[PDB]
């Protein structure tokens, strides 16, 4: 069906847009690095607490991320409510061990975990599990 | 006072995503094709007479546009207030003369002009323009 394209668009790349909305209401945009779970239809990101788009998403959580398919003009976009996870307070909470699973998942096997770890806390992380409730756009053979 | 490398990248681009906002306040994304007046700073698109949750933009008009560099992750977003024209409603009214100049900007001399009049009337084209009230985004480098 079309959704199956579209999210054929969103499993094919690991770069898209993110929208998140501003105090005033108007867009913000930004590139971000993600991983798509097909499992559960999730699009997970990791994101700093002091960036401007986090303090969005915070009292906004409703997010917006299109991704190009692989001619670079057909694209997808997936809409939903973002769940944050607190930011990273020390180097083993839960929330340290959701953002290992994502670079393992992104990244590949860490070569020091520990400094990984230390580099969550330092940032202040936070794990963006963006659930996919809507998606629309163009995808290949509609352009 | 922009950044002038953000601007060089919207300069040496011709697509990028163009952000809108909808009934419900949540942005609506598409992959758009512009042309970048460099002296006037502003950016302008065609799109089709917007309906439903996307019609919005006629009484919301702030957009923004990002458009990606050729590195690995620098990007640009121009934001500001679209002016709209009125939809193309015959194949040579002003609307259509409006985009017949934005082709010429962006493709070039077209093959069949007649042929470009009637889709630009078939799809209610509307010619946006968005002055440049602020740019930002992650300039690129030397390379
Ligand atoms: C608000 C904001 N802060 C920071 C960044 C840089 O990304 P990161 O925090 O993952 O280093 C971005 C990238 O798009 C951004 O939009």
Redesign the pocket.
Known sequence: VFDDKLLAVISGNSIGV?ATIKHDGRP??????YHFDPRKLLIQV???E?????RNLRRDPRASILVDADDGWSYAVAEGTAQLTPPAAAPDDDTVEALIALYRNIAGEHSDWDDYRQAMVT?RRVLLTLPISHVYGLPPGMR
């Open positions: 993110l913000q945009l930004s590139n971000v690095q990791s994101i700093a002091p960036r401007a788009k986090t940032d």
